[PDB]
A paper describes a structure:
Pectin methylesterases (PMEs, EC 3.1.1.11 and CE8) are important enzymes influencing the digestibility of plant cell wall material by cleaving the methoxylated groups attached to pectin and releasing methanol that are then used by methylotrophic methanogens in the rumen. Here, we present the crystal structures of PMEs belonging to the carbohydrate esterase family 8 (CE8) from Butyrivibrio proteoclasticus and Butyrivibrio fibrisolvens, determined to a resolution of 2.30 Å. These enzymes, like other PMEs, are right-handed β-helical proteins with a well-defined catalytic site and reaction mechanisms previously defined in insect, plant, and other bacterial pectin methylesterases. The catalytic triad, consisting of an arginine and two aspartic acid residues, is strictly conserved in our Pme8A and PmeC2 structures and the structural equivalent PMEs discovered via Dali analysis.
The Apo crystal structure of PmeC2 was also determined to a maximum resolution of 2.30 Å with four monomers in the asymmetric unit. The triclinic crystals of PmeC2 revealed continuous electron density of the main chain (283 residues) and a portion of the His-tag (5 residues) with side chain density being discontinuous for several solvent exposed residues. Like Pme8A, PmeC2 is a right-handed parallel β-helical structure of eight complete coils formed by a set three β-strands but, unlike Pme8A, PmeC2 lacks an additional N-terminal β-sheet and C-terminal α-helix. In addition, the solvent-exposed L2 loop (183–202) is far more elongated in PmeC2, while the L1 loop (126–147) is identical in length and orientation. Like other PMEs and Pme8A, an internal core of hydrophobic residues, including Ile4, Ile34, Ile79, Cys109, Tyr152, Phe172, Phe222, and Phe251, are placed at equivalent positions or stacked on neighbouring coils within PmeC2. The catalytic centre of PmeC2 is delineated by residues Asp119, Asp162, and Arg241, and additional pectin or substrate binding residues include Trp243, Arg244, Trp268, Thr64, Phe65, Gln96, Gln118, Arg182, Val161, Phe165, Phe122, and Phe207. In comparison to the D. dadantii structure, five residues differ in this region. These mostly bulky hydrophobic residues with fewer hydrogen bond donors and acceptors include Phe207 for a Tyr, Trp268 for a Met, Phe65 for an Ala, Phe122 for a Tyr, and Arg244 for His. We would expect that, in combination, subsites +4 and +3 in PmeC2 would form a tighter hydrophobic pocket than Pme8A and D. dadantii. However, large and considerable movements were observed for the solvent exposed loops that connect and extend from the β-strands of the enzyme, such as residues on the L2 loop (186–201), residues 54–60, and residues 268–278 at the C-terminus.
Residue numbers in the entry: -4 to 283
The structure:
């Protein structure tokens, strides 16, 4: 019957500093009638897409008291399908204690495939649609999908590297991570600046827990997030300081199949949300 031109973009080697928003408006204006996007770089770390918006920043408009998690993204992609290969996407805002949540990829398309992609941030590095049913804090979901329906998505990440500290893979998606390196980043004691003296050490706020890798809000019936043959490593987190998962919503699901865990991973594996030491019995966390 007929042929149609599809949208595929190459990003040269180098760093591209921009906030990419691949929404309905982008597709209509570029005549992408199948609302699908393929992006390609010159190699996982030779091409870098980069921005530095953080959730605690000033609000850019009359909406919200702050920029917000879900407006923090370096790249947002929606539509029927998104494919991303051979590049890095980073949010360089920094430590979540200072700049707040800061998304590298807001992955919102019904089908998402990432091959040989490096995602870098700290808190909330990778977000996979959908959002939970209801916000826990006022305005918490302000962003592209705040008032959109909670559509399920299906996501595959192959030979990727994903970095962060706190809830850095999160959302309600059905997602598979296959042969990925999952890097927990150390959260250093922060100096209390009002304790600076001339001849004496300052005081520091230590961190009880170094991080949680995965924070799903999986709906009841869906399989949710699966890590397969993935490696969990750290830069310099201390032993037994990191949890694989905590349930962002009561019934979140995360499974780890034939994964290898560095010694930064706590032997209990999974943390509660309310209470780190009491995992809500409704969570679906498994290590096979
Ligand atoms: Cl897929």
């Amino acid at each position: 019957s007929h042929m149609l031109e599809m949208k595929k973009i190459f990003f040269s080697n180098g760093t591209h500093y921009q906030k990419l928003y691949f929404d309905e408006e982008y597709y209509k204006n570029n005549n992408v009638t199948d609302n699908s996007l393929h992006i390609k770089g010159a190699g996982m770390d030779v091409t870098t897409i980069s921005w530095s918006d953080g959730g605690f920043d000033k609000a850019p408009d009359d909406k919200g008291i702050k920029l917000g998690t879900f407006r923090s993204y370096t790249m947002f992609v929606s539509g029927n399908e998104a494919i991303i290969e051979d590049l890095t996407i980073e949010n360089t805002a920094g430590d979540g204690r200072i700049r707040g949540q800061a998304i590298a990829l807001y992955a919102d398309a019904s089908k998402v495939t990432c091959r040989r992609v490096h995602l870098k941030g700290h808190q909330d590095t990778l977000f996979m649609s959908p959002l939970p049913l209801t916000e826990r804090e006022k305005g918490g979901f302000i962003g592209p999908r705040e008032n959109s329906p909670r559509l399920m998505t299906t996501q595959y990440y192959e030979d990727c590297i994903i970095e962060g500290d706190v809830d850095f893979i999160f959302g309600g998606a059905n997602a598979v991570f296959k042969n990925c390196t999952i890097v927990s980043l150390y959260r250093a004691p922060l100096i209390d600046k009002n304790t600076i003296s001339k001849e004496k050490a300052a005081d520091y706020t230590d961190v009880p827990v170094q991080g949680f890798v995965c924070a799903p809000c999986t709906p009841e019936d869906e399989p949710g997030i699966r890590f397969i043959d993935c490696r969990f490593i750290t830069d310099r987190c201390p032993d037994s300081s990191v949890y694989l998962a905590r349930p962002w919503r009561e019934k979140g699901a995360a499974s780890f199949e034939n994964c290898s865990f560095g010694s930064h991973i706590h032997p209990d594996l999974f943390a509660g949300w309310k209470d780190i030491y009491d995992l809500e019995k409704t969570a679906r966390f498994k290590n096979l």
